Design a binder for this molecule. Structure first.
Ligand SMILES: *[C@@H]1O[C@H](CO)[C@@H](O[C@@H]2O[C@H](CO)[C@@H](O)[C@H](O)[C@H]2NC(C)=O)[C@H](O)[C@H]1NC(C)=O
Ligand SMILES: *[C@@H]1O[C@H](CO)[C@@H](O[C@@H]2O[C@H](CO)[C@@H](O)[C@H](O)[C@H]2NC(C)=O)[C@H](O)[C@H]1NC(C)=O
Ligand SMILES: [Cu+2]
Ligand SMILES: [Cu+2]
Ligand SMILES: [Cu+2]
Ligand SMILES: [Cu+2]
Ligand SMILES: [F-]
Length: 497
């Protein structure tokens, strides 16, 4: 069952064995992935998060981010530790009370403390539209049409050894899948469809790191939503989906009654499908209960290319139709060296006082904000452009901006900008060496918004900055509840800070 928009959510430690290997985890709602939190556009979400964590090997503090939700006027509820709050300590709870005006689509929630989400605190978050303009394109859209793609590690996130390469041990599709090494025939997830119906499949990458090449043997996929943004119909037979991205696609159950492989090939870890790794099962009602015997093509006929996507609505692009054609045009120098990432020469290290709290206490320029050099002010009511030239090791890097979606003026692997009708989204691959992925947005949401690589290992190693949007209005725009004010004193007390 879906929970919300008003719900408790307990965060606990437990053992799980999603690929047949048992390890402890950090779980929301007792499961991996966590339960789907859902409501309708404009709803008031009240998610009372109960921190019941006791195992320090995966951190007993926590903080949860509602990825893609703009949090306008509720920056305090956004979740990134030491940006908008101090963590919740064990044995305490915290009510994330916010509204979702003007948004409808497929989102997710995750720990936003250290690399804790990798240890399991990740789940879908769906905001339905009772007047969805795409409603007539499908018949079924419910918890059974959500498809999550996850990387899973046998080594605990905090215990990944300094200076050894981090790769996953299994791909999990809806929480199940098989280990790349010492593979056991553990159970695979089954997605069931009825011959003749049409499904809104909500494809969610809850990855900590790899991108996936996602496909369904014998089927194609009609994209209708990208990171919350309704798109024109785009039919593809493969989707390369980066960490934290989402797509809705229409699946037409128009093949013979049967079993078909669902494929999610990560860019690192196990390659191929031997023993059923990287796989799930699409099963039609009435099919024999047995594995698919289908094969992938050698070459996909219509892979997704980002520049092919366009908004369903007339969203345009703010500013002027050339490079630098914005009120605040930025170009970020994104680098990696010696185990640390940096943005304009500064490696992000979370501050002791959360950025929001520093602003509410009276720090009123970005030069006064800690960490020094990590907080960049943005002016209100302005068109911002942010070029994100690739080249830093560990790519392709999926950059994400909290508090906003953005026009993708320039996409990976294509040097041509689009100032007319590019897709809008909230996480974008910045591509490869010599690319110049560029985003635009307007500043109508006062508060400190994180900008970072959504490969969690890279965020932990410093690949982030904070956009202090409209410092002068942050306080008036974001009144804070007493419970939020209480977080830092309790955290600092428990940690002897
Ligand atoms: C990516 O695009 C940005 C502009 O959006 C380029 O920025 C310019 O960089 C040159 C030096 O490299 C400066 O002289 C200009 O002031 C910058 N802004 C402009 C022209 O608008 C940047 O060079 C591009 N990067 C890559 C690697 O292609
Ligand atoms: C590279 O990106 C550009 C810009 O998004 C794409 O160019 C557009 O192509 C479409 C489809 O032919 C045209 O309708 C638009 O007028 C083009 N816009 C511009 C600004 O050129 C282009 O197709 C992409 N390249 C590939 C190979 O997909
Ligand atoms: Cu996220
Ligand atoms: Cu986010
Ligand atoms: Cu990265
Ligand atoms: Cu974030
Ligand atoms: F977000």
């Amino acid at each position: 069952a879906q929970i919300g928009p008003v719900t408790d959510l307990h965060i606990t430690n437990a053992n799980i064995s999603p690929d047949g290997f048992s390890r402890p985890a950090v779980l929301a709602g007792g499961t991996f992935p966590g339960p789907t939190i859902a409501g309708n556009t404009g709803d008031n979400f009240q998610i009372t998060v109960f921190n019941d964590l006791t195992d320090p090997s995966m951190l007993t503090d926590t903080s949860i981010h509602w990825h893609g939700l703009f949090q306008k006027g509720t920056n305090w509820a956004d979740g990134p530790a030491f940006v908008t709050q101090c963590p919740i300590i064990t044995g305490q709870s915290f009510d994330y009370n916010f509204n979702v005006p003007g948004q409808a689509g497929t989102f997710w929630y995750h720990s936003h403390l250290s690399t804790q989400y990798c240890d399991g605190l990740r789940g879908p978050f769906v905001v339905y539209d009772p007047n969805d303009p795409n409603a007539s394109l499908y018949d079924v859209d419910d918890d059974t049409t959500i498809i999550t793609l996850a990387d899973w590690y046998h080594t605990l996130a905090q215990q990944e050894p300094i200076g050894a390469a981090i790769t996953a041990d299994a791909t999990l599709i809806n929480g199940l899948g098989r280990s790349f090494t010492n593979t056991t025939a553990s159970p695979l997830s089954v997605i069931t469809v009825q011959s003749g119906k049409r499904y809104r499949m909500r494809l969610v990458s809850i990855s900590c790191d790899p991108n996936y090449l996602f496909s369904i043997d014998g089927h194609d996929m009609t994209i209708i939503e990208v990171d919350g943004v309704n798109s024109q119909q785009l039919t593809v037979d493969q989707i390369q989906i980066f960490a934290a991205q989402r797509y809705s696609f229409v699946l037409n159950a128009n093949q013979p009654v049967g079993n078909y492989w669902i494929r999610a090939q990560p860019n690192s870890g196990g390659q191929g499908f031997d023993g059923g790794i990287n796989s799930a099962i699409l099963r039609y009602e009435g099919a024999t209960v047995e594995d698919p015997t289908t094969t992938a093509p050698t070459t996909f006929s219509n892979p997704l290319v980002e520049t092919d996507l366009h908004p369903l609505a007339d969203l345009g692009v703010p500013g002027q139709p050339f490079r630098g054609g914005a009120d605040d045009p930025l170009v970020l120098n994104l680098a990696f060296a010696n185990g640390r990432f940096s943005i304009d020469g500064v490696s992000f290290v979370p501050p002791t006082v959360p950025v929001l709290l520093q602003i509410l206490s009276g720090a009123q320029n970005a030069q006064d904000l800690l960490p020094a050099g990590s907080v960049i002010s943005l002016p209100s009511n302005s068109v911002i452009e942010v070029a994100l030239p690739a080249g830093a090791a560990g790519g392709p890097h999926p950059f994400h901006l909290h508090g906003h979606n953005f026009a993708v003026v320039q996409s990976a692997n294509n040097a041509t900008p689009n100032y007319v009708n590019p897709i809008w989204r909230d996480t974008v691959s910045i591509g490869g060496t010599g690319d110049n992925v560029t985003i635009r947005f307007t500043t109508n949401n006062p508060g400190p918004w994180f900008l970072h690589c959504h490969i969690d290992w890279h965020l932990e190693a410093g690949f982030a900055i904070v956009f202090a949007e409209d410092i002068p209005d942050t306080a008036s725009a974001n009144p804070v509840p007493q419970a939020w004010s209480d977080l830092c004193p309790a955290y600092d007390q428990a940690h002897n800070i």
